[PDB]
Amino acid sequence: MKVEIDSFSGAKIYPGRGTLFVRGDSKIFRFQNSKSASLFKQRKNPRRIAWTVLFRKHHKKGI
Amino acid sequence: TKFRISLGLPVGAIMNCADNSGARNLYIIAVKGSGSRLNRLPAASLGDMVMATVKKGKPELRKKVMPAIVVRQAKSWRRRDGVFLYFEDNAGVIANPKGEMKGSAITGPVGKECADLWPRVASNSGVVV
Amino acid sequence: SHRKYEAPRHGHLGFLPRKRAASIRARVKAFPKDDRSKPVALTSFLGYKAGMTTIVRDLDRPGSKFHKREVVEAVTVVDTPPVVVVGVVGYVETPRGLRSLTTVWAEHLSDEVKRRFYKNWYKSKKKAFTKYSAKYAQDGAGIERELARIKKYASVVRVLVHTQIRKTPLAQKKAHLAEIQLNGGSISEKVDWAREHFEKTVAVDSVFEQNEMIDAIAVTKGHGFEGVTHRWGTKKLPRKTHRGLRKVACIGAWHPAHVMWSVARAGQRGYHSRTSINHKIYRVGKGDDEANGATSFDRTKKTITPMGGFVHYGEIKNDFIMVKGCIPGNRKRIVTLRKSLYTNTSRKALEEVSLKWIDTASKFGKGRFQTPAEKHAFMGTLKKDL
RNA sequence: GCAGUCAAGCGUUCAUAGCGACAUUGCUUUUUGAUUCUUCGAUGUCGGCUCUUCCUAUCAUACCGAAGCAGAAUUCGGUAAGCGUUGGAUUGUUCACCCACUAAUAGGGAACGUGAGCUGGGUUUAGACCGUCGUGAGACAGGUUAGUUUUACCCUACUGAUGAAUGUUACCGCAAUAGUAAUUGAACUUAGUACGAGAGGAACAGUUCAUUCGGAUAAUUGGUUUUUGCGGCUGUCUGAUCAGGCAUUGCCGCGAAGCUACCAUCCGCUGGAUUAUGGCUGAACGCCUCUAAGUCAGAAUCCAUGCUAGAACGCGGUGAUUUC
RNA sequence: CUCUUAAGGUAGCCAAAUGCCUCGUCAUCUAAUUAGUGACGCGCAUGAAUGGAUUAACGAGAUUCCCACUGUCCCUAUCUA
RNA sequence: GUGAACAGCCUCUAGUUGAUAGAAUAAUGUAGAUAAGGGAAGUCGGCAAAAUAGAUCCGUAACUUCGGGAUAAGGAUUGGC
RNA sequence: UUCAUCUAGACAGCCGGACGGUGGCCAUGGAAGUCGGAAUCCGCUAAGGAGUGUGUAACAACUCACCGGCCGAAUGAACUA
Ligand SMILES: [K+]
Ligand SMILES: [K+]
Ligand SMILES: [K+]
Ligand SMILES: [Mg+2]
Ligand SMILES: [Mg+2]
Ligand SMILES: [Mg+2]
Ligand SMILES: [Mg+2]
Ligand SMILES: [Mg+2]
Ligand SMILES: [Mg+2]
Ligand SMILES: [Mg+2]
Ligand SMILES: [Mg+2]
Ligand SMILES: [Mg+2]
Ligand SMILES: [Mg+2]
Ligand SMILES: [Mg+2]
Ligand SMILES: [Mg+2]
Ligand SMILES: [Mg+2]
Ligand SMILES: [Mg+2]
Ligand SMILES: [Mg+2]
Ligand SMILES: [Mg+2]
Ligand SMILES: [Mg+2]
Ligand SMILES: [Mg+2]
Ligand SMILES: [Mg+2]
Ligand SMILES: [Mg+2]
Ligand SMILES: [Mg+2]
Ligand SMILES: [Mg+2]
Ligand SMILES: [Mg+2]
Ligand SMILES: [Mg+2]
Ligand SMILES: [Mg+2]
Ligand SMILES: [Mg+2]
Ligand SMILES: [Mg+2]
Ligand SMILES: [Mg+2]
Ligand SMILES: [Mg+2]
Ligand SMILES: [Mg+2]
Ligand SMILES: [Mg+2]
Ligand SMILES: [Mg+2]
Ligand SMILES: [Mg+2]
Ligand SMILES: [Mg+2]
Ligand SMILES: [Mg+2]
Ligand SMILES: [Mg+2]
Ligand SMILES: [Mg+2]
Ligand SMILES: [Mg+2]
Ligand SMILES: [Mg+2]
Ligand SMILES: [Mg+2]
Ligand SMILES: [Mg+2]
């Protein structure tokens, strides 16, 4: 099996977990759960959402 | 020739026309192969052939019943690999009773189940899921 | 006049009455037909429903669109510590059915099974089987006489086994005792097997094996008093309905001038005995085997217990049976897993399943990590520790 | 309304494949009449919705016989009611009609089932308008609009739920009786084969799915949120802060658990006896004959296997049975 | 050309809240319309202050279609008092 | 106080804390809510509910008795500092 | 009940023959026993219809009425209830 990545939060997605969203431009978005899916639908910025790997990278958290 | 897909387009649903035939939407009036149950609306899923009319589009396509094939669903369904997925919208393409497309191109993605079910949809398709 | 539109009736008339099962342990009402050429073996096993998880495996089904592809499936985990054999029952056949001639018990019975014979164990003098254990005083002559009666009679032989709840995380502390038919030949050696196994444990791997179709017999989750709309699935009456809409509108014609048994009525839902067949064993896991949740593809040295424990159950420490799909009953409930009554050869049976991965993320939430090691590796150092 | 009998004819020939005149015998009571026996100290009067069951004069599905049955399709008929028999536009409508799917969209009963189950569009009080009629008040199976749908806590029935008594108490069982369930399609392949000049074009075996139904289940996905769990926001109040109250759950995002969805997943058994029918042997009747004696196969049928309940006045095995 | 009246329904309007036949006919609206609308009119039985025709605005009046919207429904589920 | 406001919501003075209670949290209710995808397919009928909503700026059709229609329709903005 | 056949050999059964004038007359596009109308003859005859059916376009070719070979005692038809 292959572990996917949450398009919003960077979380690791295991088989069957979360949802997959195909945008009209054929882009694929994987969400590990309804929280990340709902923030994406609300058009929040992961770089602004403080628990996402994208925010942690932009803010040099962990490193 | 296809596993069950959560029905998301009951009779009366209007999806976008994804082909270049001159139709802008398809209005579901029936679903091929659908069963019977009192009060239950016939409902389509990705890859189903429906009977539909063109509500808006070129006048030559309107005011008549024609087969269509659902290429995008937007109602979440579960693939056997455990993936719950959905598109941004519901979309279909006009076809004849034998499954051949009336148009010559699809705009936007096409569900993999539909592409496997209908080779003409697959041949005219761009991105597939 | 006629119905004016045909629909199938709501509910199954063969599962009536929708009453509470008389016991929390569902009775095995039929054992597999005896083939007296095979060795002596139990026809069923007792376990406790721990909970569900999900697995990943490669489907082997030629002609399927998912042949040699990956499929995610739901599985149920049944905690199955070995059952202790404590007795044997002989059944003679009669023009009035089967009839127990006599039961021979083991000499020493654990407190687990002894509790089953007591409503108030804590204040009893625990006299159960104290005079019976004296039947083994010097030679066990009476015990051997009863076993000889069973051999001379008793066309059907069943052992009495009890669970070891002390090995489960359950608080119940009172074992479940059940009769399991012994299949295999020579009723004499059925009796010999039972006598030799007195006071001894039998593990689930000696009863069940990988890929085997089994049946699950359990009392379903109870839901109390239920109205027709959910108890039977009848159509909700329109919003305009005076006096409520979660009802059946016409509960009968004028004649017969009686409500008929087939009309949906409100009553108890759930807590019914159910025997559901053809659940494939996906794993026969052992408690002592660390890497219980591991496969030949995952190799993560982890057990079957999800992170944080099986919700409302605890941790799997014993032998366990992983069946495909779902089985009747809720978590912590005693379940009887029995061998199939027929030889299924349908290519859905007979398929050799190899698990590729077993989910162990927490079921207490949207579990993100399979192991605490993976959680630490993803999250880095936190303030508390790690 | 449905079904027979006869058989002049139709069916290119040919009465009876399928039909069938002139006649004639019936059945049914889902038509409408006829009657006025019951009800006028009152049986709630259309239709629909909902739900159960029953009938068979069978639309489909099973197995078959016949054909003007080459195949395919169809038609006639037998056992058959086990199983299903739909979504819509217009109309109060029943009925009708069309669109459409479907294996098929069969007909009916149950106080023209079903109003203390609903609804109240219609009819069928009182308001009002029109047309025709009437001098008029007013009439109108003419049209139109508005118009209170009451009560169960009793008995039974039904659904579930306790329970005295059998020395007590406990555990494990048996199984009388009662119920019972699965359903239908598609695709691949057989096979572009059999068959057919051709056009076309099967089936059995095998495989993957699906429809309708049913029983569970909550790993996942989704829904639900008083977890008032975390955060945010408005207004006001606690001098400010922190932290809070109130806004009838203040509002918003996320939200675990639980519950739950063909909106999720899993599961839904195999033996015998038969019906129609086709056969064996074989007389009656030197032949013939599935039938008479005997006998073989055989249906979605039946009875079992299996599944649910367990007789609270059916039964068995087993443990312990009170020093005072 | 007849019979005939007090006068023989004029201007208008209509299957209209007035048309039996009738779900009239044509067109439009829909996949499908006994609905709606526009036309037609030998109109059972339309029609001129018993007011005719029309009308901006107004209407808890009757009606049809469309967009939005939704648990009305598919098909139900859940929560609170 | 907010606010256009005698609106709603919170507060001061004053007044009251009165409605039979206790325990549970089944069905069916009454009242209040939410709901994937579809969006009136429900129904006689969109009944009920939802959606809209304040203010500022832009923009506003047929028709009209010239007065209206009109908040037509249709858009954009709004906090804090 | 009635009428028939029958040791001068019945019924059934199996087997043999089932001819010639003659493609009888008429027609028909063709019609030979057999799509039809009409005539129902004669010889050989133990016996054979100008034909009981199948068959051909017509032929042909099979088949039956009819008579024989075998068997040997009963049998057939139409009615009545
Ligand atoms: K009366
Ligand atoms: K949840
Ligand atoms: K506050
Ligand atoms: Mg969730
Ligand atoms: Mg309906
Ligand atoms: Mg019916
Ligand atoms: Mg259910
Ligand atoms: Mg009401
Ligand atoms: Mg969980
Ligand atoms: Mg009364
Ligand atoms: Mg009454
Ligand atoms: Mg019949
Ligand atoms: Mg009635
Ligand atoms: Mg009633
Ligand atoms: Mg009533
Ligand atoms: Mg009624
Ligand atoms: Mg009314
Ligand atoms: Mg009135
Ligand atoms: Mg008058
Ligand atoms: Mg009247
Ligand atoms: Mg909330
Ligand atoms: Mg206060
Ligand atoms: Mg608060
Ligand atoms: Mg024979
Ligand atoms: Mg017989
Ligand atoms: Mg009993
Ligand atoms: Mg005029
Ligand atoms: Mg008129
Ligand atoms: Mg009109
Ligand atoms: Mg309409
Ligand atoms: Mg005048
Ligand atoms: Mg008038
Ligand atoms: Mg007014
Ligand atoms: Mg101010
Ligand atoms: Mg919704
Ligand atoms: Mg939505
Ligand atoms: Mg919409
Ligand atoms: Mg409608
Ligand atoms: Mg309807
Ligand atoms: Mg209507
Ligand atoms: Mg309203
Ligand atoms: Mg505006
Ligand atoms: Mg306007
Ligand atoms: Mg001829």
PDB file of N, CA and C (backbone and C1' of nucleotides) in Angstrom, chain D residues 182-205:
ATOM      1  P     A D 182     -33.935 -18.996   1.447  1.00  0.00           P
ATOM      2  O5'   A D 182     -34.130 -18.990  -0.132  1.00  0.00           O
ATOM      3  C5'   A D 182     -33.585 -17.954  -0.938  1.00  0.00           C
ATOM      4  C4'   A D 182     -34.542 -16.796  -1.062  1.00  0.00           C
ATOM      5  C3'   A D 182     -34.727 -16.215  -2.450  1.00  0.00           C
ATOM      6  O3'   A D 182     -35.601 -16.986  -3.253  1.00  0.00           O
ATOM      7  C1'   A D 182     -34.460 -14.464  -0.892  1.00  0.00           C
ATOM      8  P     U D 183     -35.347 -17.115  -4.831  1.00  0.00           P
ATOM      9  O5'   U D 183     -35.578 -15.643  -5.380  1.00  0.00           O
ATOM     10  C5'   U D 183     -36.864 -15.049  -5.365  1.00  0.00           C
ATOM     11  C4'   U D 183     -36.811 -13.646  -5.904  1.00  0.00           C
ATOM     12  C3'   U D 183     -36.229 -13.506  -7.299  1.00  0.00           C
ATOM     13  O3'   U D 183     -37.184 -13.765  -8.307  1.00  0.00           O
ATOM     14  C1'   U D 183     -35.233 -11.918  -5.870  1.00  0.00           C
ATOM     15  P     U D 184     -36.859 -14.814  -9.471  1.00  0.00           P
ATOM     16  O5'   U D 184     -36.287 -13.908 -10.644  1.00  0.00           O
ATOM     17  C5'   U D 184     -37.104 -12.921 -11.247  1.00  0.00           C
ATOM     18  C4'   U D 184     -36.319 -11.689 -11.613  1.00  0.00           C
ATOM     19  C3'   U D 184     -35.179 -11.875 -12.595  1.00  0.00           C
ATOM     20  O3'   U D 184     -35.602 -12.021 -13.936  1.00  0.00           O
ATOM     21  C1'   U D 184     -34.466 -10.499 -10.831  1.00  0.00           C
ATOM     22  P     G D 185     -34.586 -12.610 -15.028  1.00  0.00           P
ATOM     23  O5'   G D 185     -33.599 -11.400 -15.324  1.00  0.00           O
ATOM     24  C5'   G D 185     -34.092 -10.201 -15.895  1.00  0.00           C
ATOM     25  C4'   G D 185     -33.078  -9.091 -15.844  1.00  0.00           C
ATOM     26  C3'   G D 185     -31.836  -9.281 -16.694  1.00  0.00           C
ATOM     27  O3'   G D 185     -32.058  -8.946 -18.049  1.00  0.00           O
ATOM     28  C1'   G D 185     -31.216  -8.537 -14.542  1.00  0.00           C
ATOM     29  P     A D 186     -31.196  -9.641 -19.206  1.00  0.00           P
ATOM     30  O5'   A D 186     -29.796  -8.888 -19.143  1.00  0.00           O
ATOM     31  C5'   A D 186     -29.724  -7.480 -19.299  1.00  0.00           C
ATOM     32  C4'   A D 186     -28.386  -6.937 -18.865  1.00  0.00           C
ATOM     33  C3'   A D 186     -27.165  -7.552 -19.523  1.00  0.00           C
ATOM     34  O3'   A D 186     -26.930  -7.045 -20.823  1.00  0.00           O
ATOM     35  C1'   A D 186     -26.795  -7.349 -17.200  1.00  0.00           C
ATOM     36  P     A D 187     -26.297  -7.989 -21.953  1.00  0.00           P
ATOM     37  O5'   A D 187     -24.730  -7.894 -21.698  1.00  0.00           O
ATOM     38  C5'   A D 187     -24.088  -6.638 -21.535  1.00  0.00           C
ATOM     39  C4'   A D 187     -22.740  -6.800 -20.882  1.00  0.00           C
ATOM     40  C3'   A D 187     -21.876  -7.921 -21.435  1.00  0.00           C
ATOM     41  O3'   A D 187     -21.170  -7.543 -22.602  1.00  0.00           O
ATOM     42  C1'   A D 187     -21.914  -8.048 -19.079  1.00  0.00           C
ATOM     43  P     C D 188     -20.778  -8.648 -23.695  1.00  0.00           P
ATOM     44  O5'   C D 188     -19.601  -9.465 -23.003  1.00  0.00           O
ATOM     45  C5'   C D 188     -18.373  -8.835 -22.673  1.00  0.00           C
ATOM     46  C4'   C D 188     -17.439  -9.785 -21.971  1.00  0.00           C
ATOM     47  C3'   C D 188     -17.185 -11.106 -22.675  1.00  0.00           C
ATOM     48  O3'   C D 188     -16.202 -11.006 -23.689  1.00  0.00           O
ATOM     49  C1'   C D 188     -17.634 -11.495 -20.385  1.00  0.00           C
ATOM     50  P     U D 189     -16.348 -11.849 -25.045  1.00  0.00           P
ATOM     51  O5'   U D 189     -16.360 -13.365 -24.560  1.00  0.00           O
ATOM     52  C5'   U D 189     -15.205 -13.968 -23.994  1.00  0.00           C
ATOM     53  C4'   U D 189     -15.515 -15.343 -23.460  1.00  0.00           C
ATOM     54  C3'   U D 189     -16.164 -16.302 -24.443  1.00  0.00           C
ATOM     55  O3'   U D 189     -15.227 -16.920 -25.303  1.00  0.00           O
ATOM     56  C1'   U D 189     -17.318 -16.380 -22.382  1.00  0.00           C
ATOM     57  P     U D 190     -15.646 -17.293 -26.802  1.00  0.00           P
ATOM     58  O5'   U D 190     -16.675 -18.495 -26.626  1.00  0.00           O
ATOM     59  C5'   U D 190     -16.273 -19.716 -26.022  1.00  0.00           C
ATOM     60  C4'   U D 190     -17.460 -20.589 -25.705  1.00  0.00           C
ATOM     61  C3'   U D 190     -18.395 -20.884 -26.865  1.00  0.00           C
ATOM     62  O3'   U D 190     -17.922 -21.936 -27.685  1.00  0.00           O
ATOM     63  C1'   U D 190     -19.656 -20.270 -24.959  1.00  0.00           C
ATOM     64  P     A D 191     -18.152 -21.888 -29.270  1.00  0.00           P
ATOM     65  O5'   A D 191     -17.651 -20.438 -29.692  1.00  0.00           O
ATOM     66  C5'   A D 191     -17.627 -20.043 -31.060  1.00  0.00           C
ATOM     67  C4'   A D 191     -18.089 -18.618 -31.247  1.00  0.00           C
ATOM     68  C3'   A D 191     -17.462 -17.589 -30.310  1.00  0.00           C
ATOM     69  O3'   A D 191     -17.369 -16.344 -30.996  1.00  0.00           O
ATOM     70  C1'   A D 191     -19.795 -17.559 -30.048  1.00  0.00           C
ATOM     71  P     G D 192     -16.079 -15.969 -31.872  1.00  0.00           P
ATOM     72  O5'   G D 192     -16.556 -14.693 -32.698  1.00  0.00           O
ATOM     73  C5'   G D 192     -16.980 -14.804 -34.052  1.00  0.00           C
ATOM     74  C4'   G D 192     -18.371 -15.377 -34.172  1.00  0.00           C
ATOM     75  C3'   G D 192     -18.862 -15.601 -35.605  1.00  0.00           C
ATOM     76  O3'   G D 192     -19.708 -16.749 -35.629  1.00  0.00           O
ATOM     77  C1'   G D 192     -20.353 -14.181 -34.493  1.00  0.00           C
ATOM     78  P     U D 193     -20.041 -17.495 -37.011  1.00  0.00           P
ATOM     79  O5'   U D 193     -20.182 -19.023 -36.592  1.00  0.00           O
ATOM     80  C5'   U D 193     -19.084 -19.734 -36.048  1.00  0.00           C
ATOM     81  C4'   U D 193     -19.542 -20.747 -35.032  1.00  0.00           C
ATOM     82  C3'   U D 193     -20.898 -21.378 -35.302  1.00  0.00           C
ATOM     83  O3'   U D 193     -20.825 -22.453 -36.222  1.00  0.00           O
ATOM     84  C1'   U D 193     -20.791 -20.668 -33.048  1.00  0.00           C
ATOM     85  P     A D 194     -21.936 -22.630 -37.368  1.00  0.00           P
ATOM     86  O5'   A D 194     -23.119 -23.400 -36.636  1.00  0.00           O
ATOM     87  C5'   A D 194     -22.910 -24.691 -36.084  1.00  0.00           C
ATOM     88  C4'   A D 194     -23.996 -25.058 -35.108  1.00  0.00           C
ATOM     89  C3'   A D 194     -25.412 -25.066 -35.661  1.00  0.00           C
ATOM     90  O3'   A D 194     -25.726 -26.293 -36.293  1.00  0.00           O
ATOM     91  C1'   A D 194     -25.358 -23.885 -33.606  1.00  0.00           C
ATOM     92  P     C D 195     -25.970 -26.370 -37.876  1.00  0.00           P
ATOM     93  O5'   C D 195     -27.302 -25.534 -38.098  1.00  0.00           O
ATOM     94  C5'   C D 195     -28.493 -25.859 -37.399  1.00  0.00           C
ATOM     95  C4'   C D 195     -29.490 -24.737 -37.494  1.00  0.00           C
ATOM     96  C3'   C D 195     -29.608 -24.088 -38.860  1.00  0.00           C
ATOM     97  O3'   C D 195     -30.412 -24.826 -39.760  1.00  0.00           O
ATOM     98  C1'   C D 195     -29.437 -22.410 -37.211  1.00  0.00           C
ATOM     99  P     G D 196     -29.965 -24.972 -41.294  1.00  0.00           P
ATOM    100  O5'   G D 196     -30.179 -23.514 -41.891  1.00  0.00           O
ATOM    101  C5'   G D 196     -31.467 -22.924 -41.905  1.00  0.00           C
ATOM    102  C4'   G D 196     -31.397 -21.440 -42.156  1.00  0.00           C
ATOM    103  C3'   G D 196     -30.668 -20.999 -43.409  1.00  0.00           C
ATOM    104  O3'   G D 196     -31.408 -21.197 -44.599  1.00  0.00           O
ATOM    105  C1'   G D 196     -30.013 -19.633 -41.611  1.00  0.00           C
ATOM    106  P     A D 197     -30.696 -21.877 -45.868  1.00  0.00           P
ATOM    107  O5'   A D 197     -29.436 -20.941 -46.137  1.00  0.00           O
ATOM    108  C5'   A D 197     -28.437 -21.302 -47.080  1.00  0.00           C
ATOM    109  C4'   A D 197     -28.056 -20.128 -47.945  1.00  0.00           C
ATOM    110  C3'   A D 197     -27.687 -18.850 -47.207  1.00  0.00           C
ATOM    111  O3'   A D 197     -26.339 -18.834 -46.781  1.00  0.00           O
ATOM    112  C1'   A D 197     -29.213 -18.354 -48.945  1.00  0.00           C
ATOM    113  P     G D 198     -25.954 -18.239 -45.343  1.00  0.00           P
ATOM    114  O5'   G D 198     -26.410 -16.716 -45.415  1.00  0.00           O
ATOM    115  C5'   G D 198     -25.697 -15.772 -46.201  1.00  0.00           C
ATOM    116  C4'   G D 198     -26.520 -14.532 -46.442  1.00  0.00           C
ATOM    117  C3'   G D 198     -26.739 -13.639 -45.231  1.00  0.00           C
ATOM    118  O3'   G D 198     -25.671 -12.726 -45.049  1.00  0.00           O
ATOM    119  C1'   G D 198     -28.803 -14.010 -46.353  1.00  0.00           C
ATOM    120  P     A D 199     -25.206 -12.280 -43.580  1.00  0.00           P
ATOM    121  O5'   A D 199     -26.317 -11.236 -43.127  1.00  0.00           O
ATOM    122  C5'   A D 199     -26.643 -10.110 -43.928  1.00  0.00           C
ATOM    123  C4'   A D 199     -27.972  -9.531 -43.518  1.00  0.00           C
ATOM    124  C3'   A D 199     -28.150  -9.332 -42.021  1.00  0.00           C
ATOM    125  O3'   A D 199     -27.616  -8.100 -41.570  1.00  0.00           O
ATOM    126  C1'   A D 199     -29.996 -10.527 -42.867  1.00  0.00           C
ATOM    127  P     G D 200     -26.788  -8.032 -40.199  1.00  0.00           P
ATOM    128  O5'   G D 200     -27.917  -7.862 -39.092  1.00  0.00           O
ATOM    129  C5'   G D 200     -27.906  -8.638 -37.906  1.00  0.00           C
ATOM    130  C4'   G D 200     -29.031  -9.640 -37.910  1.00  0.00           C
ATOM    131  C3'   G D 200     -29.155 -10.505 -36.668  1.00  0.00           C
ATOM    132  O3'   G D 200     -29.877  -9.859 -35.637  1.00  0.00           O
ATOM    133  C1'   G D 200     -29.282 -11.863 -38.606  1.00  0.00           C
ATOM    134  P     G D 201     -29.342  -9.879 -34.126  1.00  0.00           P
ATOM    135  O5'   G D 201     -29.218 -11.426 -33.780  1.00  0.00           O
ATOM    136  C5'   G D 201     -30.361 -12.266 -33.739  1.00  0.00           C
ATOM    137  C4'   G D 201     -29.957 -13.695 -33.502  1.00  0.00           C
ATOM    138  C3'   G D 201     -28.852 -13.885 -32.480  1.00  0.00           C
ATOM    139  O3'   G D 201     -29.313 -13.842 -31.144  1.00  0.00           O
ATOM    140  C1'   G D 201     -28.322 -15.109 -34.411  1.00  0.00           C
ATOM    141  P     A D 202     -28.332 -13.324 -29.987  1.00  0.00           P
ATOM    142  O5'   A D 202     -27.408 -14.583 -29.690  1.00  0.00           O
ATOM    143  C5'   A D 202     -27.545 -15.316 -28.485  1.00  0.00           C
ATOM    144  C4'   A D 202     -28.712 -16.268 -28.532  1.00  0.00           C
ATOM    145  C3'   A D 202     -28.753 -17.295 -27.413  1.00  0.00           C
ATOM    146  O3'   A D 202     -29.326 -16.781 -26.225  1.00  0.00           O
ATOM    147  C1'   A D 202     -29.053 -18.388 -29.479  1.00  0.00           C
ATOM    148  P     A D 203     -28.475 -16.746 -24.866  1.00  0.00           P
ATOM    149  O5'   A D 203     -28.744 -18.172 -24.216  1.00  0.00           O
ATOM    150  C5'   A D 203     -30.016 -18.791 -24.321  1.00  0.00           C
ATOM    151  C4'   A D 203     -29.897 -20.289 -24.237  1.00  0.00           C
ATOM    152  C3'   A D 203     -28.919 -20.804 -23.197  1.00  0.00           C
ATOM    153  O3'   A D 203     -29.483 -20.839 -21.899  1.00  0.00           O
ATOM    154  C1'   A D 203     -28.555 -21.922 -25.247  1.00  0.00           C
ATOM    155  P     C D 204     -28.577 -20.535 -20.611  1.00  0.00           P
ATOM    156  O5'   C D 204     -27.978 -21.958 -20.231  1.00  0.00           O
ATOM    157  C5'   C D 204     -28.812 -23.104 -20.179  1.00  0.00           C
ATOM    158  C4'   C D 204     -28.001 -24.369 -20.086  1.00  0.00           C
ATOM    159  C3'   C D 204     -26.770 -24.307 -19.201  1.00  0.00           C
ATOM    160  O3'   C D 204     -27.064 -24.407 -17.821  1.00  0.00           O
ATOM    161  C1'   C D 204     -26.218 -25.361 -21.235  1.00  0.00           C
ATOM    162  P     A D 205     -26.190 -23.585 -16.753  1.00  0.00           P
ATOM    163  O5'   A D 205     -24.724 -24.188 -16.911  1.00  0.00           O
ATOM    164  C5'   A D 205     -24.433 -25.518 -16.512  1.00  0.00           C
ATOM    165  C4'   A D 205     -22.982 -25.856 -16.741  1.00  0.00           C
ATOM    166  C3'   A D 205     -21.974 -24.873 -16.173  1.00  0.00           C
ATOM    167  O3'   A D 205     -21.755 -25.028 -14.783  1.00  0.00           O
ATOM    168  C1'   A D 205     -21.391 -25.357 -18.393  1.00  0.00           C
TER     169        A D 205
END
